[PDB]
Amino acid sequence: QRTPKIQVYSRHPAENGKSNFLNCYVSGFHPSDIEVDLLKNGERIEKVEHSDLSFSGDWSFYLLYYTEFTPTEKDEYACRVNHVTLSQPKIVKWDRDM
């Protein structure tokens, strides 16, 4: 088994009040079942889409989860990922500089 790598980031450079896409990229994991939520101020965002399951040369899987969002100064965004490899869900906060 392989625990997921996680990155949270925007499609375009964030500008407050401008529409954008919030991404959570999970990769390198096996088996494929995985729970990924995008959170706004700690609350699950409802309309999240994801890419079609695919995998790498080593059989490990990767998925991009994404949602339209309009960043602001004070709203806090994060990705919450659970997988059979983890003792508890991992929360990775969105940082517009990374």
Binding site: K5, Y25, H30, D33, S54, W59
Partner: protein
């Protein structure tokens, strides 16, 4: 060089319905098709503009292939449990990847096909495209079935014929995106951490294809063990992002240079803060 690659995954979910089958097809780093057995009306669907123009016969035919292969994978998952005497209560995964690579001459460089069961190599088509390698005694049962079906001949004909012919067609119909590499937009950002040191982060954005090299040098020497380097990630519009960062002493920023290699750059780039 160019490649067409297919990725099939079938995953059982005991107590939650039939196994789900997903197929995705790529040219290089660009997805062009998908099939998801869980979709409301499962069909092969275009994911790139340069196959949206194939007509209904093409799409219906692909759809049929995926629907029949989903059914077959469900039987196969049962067969595999039989070989190992695994209980129906546990989830299992069957993966298959196959495709063709072309060299700079537009000629087949290699065809391949490989399968994995629960993440472990199970059976693979040999380089000669005429025989198989089985990883264990269950896969030897599969190999003897495929040998009796003479299926390697069908792989040879597909990999050396159809796969090449259709990769070349896609490359031509999609050449304004598939054969025109998009160079990374680059910049360096500075993030003081204390009065006395600061992070320099070198950014590569909006590039295609995904392969890139991003490194920091100090006075022309590599900083490999001192560079934080994120994995290349999809922007979600078909292009990719990456960054590399080093922590430097205040006032010493001019010693540092960021180096970018990418197929869309006429020559390697050197950047500074």
């Amino acid at each position: 060089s160019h490649s067409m690659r297919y990725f099939y995954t079938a995953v059982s979910r005991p107590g939650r319905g039939e196994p789900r089958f997903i197929a995705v097809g790529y040219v290089d780093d660009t997805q062009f098709v998908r099939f998801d057995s869980d979709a409301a009306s499962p069909r092969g669907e275009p994911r790139a503009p340069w196959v949206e123009q194939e007509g209904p016969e093409y799409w219906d035919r692909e759809t049929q292939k995926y629907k029949r292969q989903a059914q077959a994978d469900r039987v196969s998952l049962r067969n595999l449990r039989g070989y190992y005497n695994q209980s129906e209560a546990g989830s299992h995964t069957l993966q298959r990847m196959y495709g063709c690579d072309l060299g700079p001459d537009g000629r087949l460089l290699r065809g391949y096909d490989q399968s994995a069961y629960d993440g472990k190599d199970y059976i693979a088509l040999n380089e000669d495209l005429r025989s198989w390698t089985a990883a264990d005694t269950a896969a030897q049962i599969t190999q003897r079935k495929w040998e009796a079906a003479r299926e390697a001949e069908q792989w040879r004909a597909y990999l050396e014929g159809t796969c090449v012919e259709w990769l070349r067609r896609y490359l031509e119909n999609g050449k304004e995106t598939l054969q025109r590499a998009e160079h990374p937009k680059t910049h360096v950002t500075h993030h003081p951490v204390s009065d006395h040191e600061a992070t320099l982060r070198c950014w590569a954005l909006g590039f295609y294809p995904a392969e890139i090299t991003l490194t920091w040098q100090r006075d022309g020497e590599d900083q490999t063990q001192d560079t934080e380097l994120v994995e290349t990630r999809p922007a979600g519009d078909g292009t990719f992002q990456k960054w590399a960062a080093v922590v430097v002493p205040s006032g010493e920023e001019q010693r540092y240079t960021c180096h970018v290699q990418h197929e869309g750059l006429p020559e390697p780039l050197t950047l500074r803060w």
